[PDB]
């Protein structure tokens, strides 16, 4: 009766986004694992780019603009601009709330 350890994953958030974009559509376990790995890889890429951006400018804080510059560097064009728009909108809403 040894309970397995807690393994964190983005499965629930990916499922919520899928239900937002496709209500009557499911996802298999392998596809969910692939999406989780994609999220982890993109997270690592953007975080590393922001970290080296901060190091280059001799800054000790990763801020919104560092993440924005990382997104602009790593994403191909229209994806980058739409991601920047979504990020700025989310940050503005969060700041407006509290």
């Amino acid at each position: 009766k040894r309970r397995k350890t807690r393994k964190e994953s983005y499965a629930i958030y990916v499922y919520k986004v899928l239900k937002q974009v496709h209500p009557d559509t499911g996802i298999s376990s392998k596809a969910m694992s692939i999406m989780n790995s994609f999220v982890n890889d993109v997270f690592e890429r953007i975080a590393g780019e922001a970290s080296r951006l901060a190091h280059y400018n001799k800054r000790s804080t990763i801020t919104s603009r560092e993440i924005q510059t990382a997104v602009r560097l790593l994403l191909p064009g229209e994806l980058a601009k739409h991601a920047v728009s979504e990020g700025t909108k989310a940050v503005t809403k969060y700041t407006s709330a509290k």
Binding site: Q20, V21, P23, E78, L79, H82
Partner: peptide, 8 residues
């Protein structure tokens, strides 16, 4: 319920 402007 969600649509992206990239695909128009």
């Amino acid at each position: 319920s969600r649509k992206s402007m990239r695909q128009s």
